Symmetry: D2
Subunit: 324 residues, 4 copies
């Protein structure tokens, strides 16, 4: 059997409420990893699992300094001969951010699978137990190697680069509308469909081993009447990058243009992304900043933060956006 | 034949580029309304059309003061016995905002149909001509009355309350993943599928006749490491409301909580929405602010602005979010 | 509390397998209704429920003669003052057919909610418990009246007319891509979004009280090299109608045209539907047969069977396809 | 510039109607290939194109014997040093069948791109011109090599293995809900997202050079009351295989089981697929026949026909269903 480490960070998957139908007033990140494992003893037929408690928080409180430590820990684990893969239990709300960070920074082809749940462990029809079992199956399969970081929920295997939480509250929320899933798990069998045609993991140039902090990057929304003062505030607080969750294809109002030009004059890198949820922001030399390709704003922030650890050259940063 | 006014505001539908494949370096909002009409002379078999040029701008520059005028003009037009419906040509980037504004403020059951195009008029396979023809068909059909404000592109009829631009750059971008379309136009025939179960138009309390400006509302994004200083900036600039494009189901970090509590102390109304793109943000009294129900951040901003013209009572505002 | 009858027919919701991960070799339709109710005692806080065992079969074996009796029983129940609504447990494979049959033949505005499960009751993270509780919530809410027959799974409320099983094996399979959901159930609260703009239930002309069988209707697939001999076989076995699950928009090969013309010469009514999964098959007088509007093949069969209890007139039948 | 052959077979892309809004009463496959080319002279900046007229038919009339000749011709063309790629203009209705056939039988890494249109060439906002330009762009890019056969419409590049016509009548009908697109074409640039994780073209065992006909395979639908006599008819007419477009996950009624057992006793190979549109049909040794994995019925028929040119062995055929 493969040796899988379950590295727990918190989330609703580790939530415990007073009744089976209670959806508020409980902490998302209360139960320990061994309680998760022991609720699905079937996992022991799939792998030799060892639980490690990395943190226990709601993912809306996950921070880059913590995700950096997570990446460093996972790199240490996967460097061991006695670790075949890692499953990371996490909150759903920012799992796409943490997962994409590890996608770019983990220097191994051994699987790294993020798993989460939309219902707490105490819920009627809780999804966490099956999601964890699926995640372990994926992490221990030798066919799962070399595929980049994955996010597994609801019988689907999503690439960290494409997968996003698309719905505030449903079990099927994690989708990649234009890129689909890497694979699916049906009837206790994994079906791989796609390999992502982007750089990642052992083919990624990003390395943050030995870093202890990351560049500051903020995200500003685009909308009718969007204000220039938010750009001024970000600049004043020393951001190194701004990701613009733009109207349409990174379109920018007269006010946003003024903000962006100010930022660029102070050496801030601006990435024009989109608030729409999907698709390509194409190059446009008449507008300020760089473009995000198909990265959504949350992902774009992660790639920009990592880019800024190793370059300040806009040409190189733009090329990263087209290749990672 | 029905008498339809085509009220033009700009957009890529009125864009004109130097070649058939050029997608940048042209102004979205350059062609006049009569050029659009004359490019589809078939529209004169469907309706007696009259063009009126309201504005000619890219929709990323549309502002609430201008949308207020638009609403007022459309009400004047629909008050006339010689006007059976209005088609509004507009940019795709913010059409959802303008349309939802009119959905709540137009005091007639006569059809109001927004139309737009993802490719400029000069493009190969431009979508504007057929979109405009479909929109005119919709606006003139007696079966279209009483349905709320509609957005028509790509053979689909979307409710202004549910429809959003979901993709930065595709023709099929306008979708309502959970709510579907009101109807479709296939083979020159309209097929109505749904009526929205929300208040609108003639049953809406919002009336902005005579107003000349609207309450200031900004939108802030939720993400890992989201900073409190953006709340401080918005407060300092005198916002009346803040819409939060939250992680997951309006989930809030410790920093966002501190920001939101500060804003609420100053009398700012905070609405928690979602950055995910779809779904319900459920109530949670322990978190700050009101919740957006299934309104996305752009729509939630429009409803909040209108709500604040009538009330500062949280109970009443929250009920608007559940019913409009 | 509302009085709700849970009328059980079988399905995977009532399936019981030897382990938590076994997905084959168990009978869908083994557990009794009271075992379903007793697994979710929370239901007794939502309604006064009474279980009735109508049948216990896998839904692939559900037949029109049995669905007729199901409709007749439901009508009997809803005619009672002591019944406020009904939930029908059923297999997922043909629930859309049974549900649409009841949608057209149930003469009450009281809610009728079909419910099902993709994983058996014994499965890890079984969906049936929560699906049943959601269904009971929907059936007992006074806001649910007059909406037509509903299908409830995975926090979604779908209209019987639009909802279909879109995926062979996932929990989120029931979707209506173009029409959306009537509503959703999130955080123990129902959010109604739409009302279907079609005839149903109390406004439907179809009445089958007193019938003991239905007219025979088969479905033939369209594809490259589709054979004429399948039309001959159907005609020889006495079908009254044929639904063609056509290529594209009910397109027909030379072979299919010959088969259809032969069928129509014998008095068979032919409906051209689509194998695609969605959309409108538009009228085309140059092709044989009537068109299915947006009814998929399984639904189109149900409507044709019901139509043939009332009329043989093509004009009238075609109008049913456009209104039901 | 690359040298691209445009091999025309017909379809609505080659349709010509009397007015810009006419959607019936015109032949789909009337215009010649040069007339398509001459409508988009921009193509000359992308490639040196040569048109060749293979056929001119509606795709509902495409037959396996003709697709076999199409595959043979494409193989001849791509064996030439002066051909870099091939674009095939085709009807939308069965493009997925012809494309998947070529995906398994074309013995080259040079791109083969099928292209089609939902609106005829004479239509207002006809999609064919831009679809053809995109297809030529894809066929001529050196990055497009080795990706398997592609289907290009509406700015999307779909794998022939996953893409299907999902809507009877809309421009955006070609989707792969679970597998996404291989890439997209926005702003005159190709963005590759995925590589399919299945065998195709140069790695495929299927070679039909020298064949003039193929094994007979029919498709039978699954539904309530599905009749055994259709199996008897297929058997009597000498089918070598039957693809069952099953209820749910290839579920079979008692009648279908009896039919399938009869077919198998006569040496017919039975593949259980799904009518649902998407997803995996899992193995189940208690049911008759082989399973289609995620192939939909139309694709399953194509694979089974090709498999039968080589083997009758169920173990090998089942493996093909899991790897092609
Ligand atoms: N707020 C929770 C939500 C979840 O996990 O479903 C979290 O992200 O930690
Ligand atoms: N920027 C343009 C884009 C479009 O209309 O497609 C607009 O919103 O005005
Ligand atoms: N074959 C089962 C499948 C399910 O219910 O999920 C049924 O329809 O009865
Ligand atoms: N019946 C046409 C439809 C199209 O091309 O859109 C064909 O398949 O040939």
């Amino acid at each position: 059997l493969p040796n899988i480490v379950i590295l727990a960070t918190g989330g609703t998957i580790a939530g415990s409420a007073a009744t089976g139908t209670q959806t508020t007033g409980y902490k998302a990140g209360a139960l320990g990893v061994d309680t998760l494992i022991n609720a699905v003893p079937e996992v022991k037929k799939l792998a030799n699992v060892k639980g490690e408690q990395f943190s226990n928080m709601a993912s809306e409180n996950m921070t880059g300094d913590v995700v950096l430590k997570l990446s460093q820990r996972v790199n240490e684990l996967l460097a061991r001969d006695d670790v075949d893969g890692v499953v990371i239990t996490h909150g759903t709300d920012t799992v796409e951010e943490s997962a994409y960070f590890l996608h770019l920074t983990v220097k191994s082809d051994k699987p790294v699978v993020f798993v989460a749940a939309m219902r707490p462990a105490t819920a009627i029809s809780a999804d966490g137990p099956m999601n964890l079992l699926e995640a372990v199956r994926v992490a221990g399969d030798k066919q799962s190697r070399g595929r980049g970081v994955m996010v597994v929920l609801n019988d689907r295997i999503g690439s960290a680069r494409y997968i996003t939480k698309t719905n505030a509250s449903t079990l099927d929320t994690f989708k990649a509308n234009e890129e689909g899933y890497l694979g699916v798990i049906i009837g206790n069998r994994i079906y791989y469909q796609n390999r992502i045609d982007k750089l990642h993991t052992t083919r990624s140039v990003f390395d943050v081993r030995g870093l202890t902090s990351l560049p500051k990057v903020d995200i500003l929304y685009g909308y009718q009447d969007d204000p220039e003062y938010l750009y001024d505030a970000a600049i004043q607080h020393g951001v190194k990058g701004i990701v613009y969750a733009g109207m349409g294809a990174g379109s920018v109002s007269v006010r946003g243009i003024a903000g962006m030009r100010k930022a660029m004059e102070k050496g801030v890198v601006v990435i024009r992304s989109t608030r729409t949820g999907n698709g390509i922001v194409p190059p446009d030399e008449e507008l300020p900043g760089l473009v995000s390709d198909s990265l959504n704003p949350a992902h774009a922030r992660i790639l920009l933060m990592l880019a800024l650890t190793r370059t300040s050259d806009p040409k190189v940063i733009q090329e990263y956006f087209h290749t990672y």
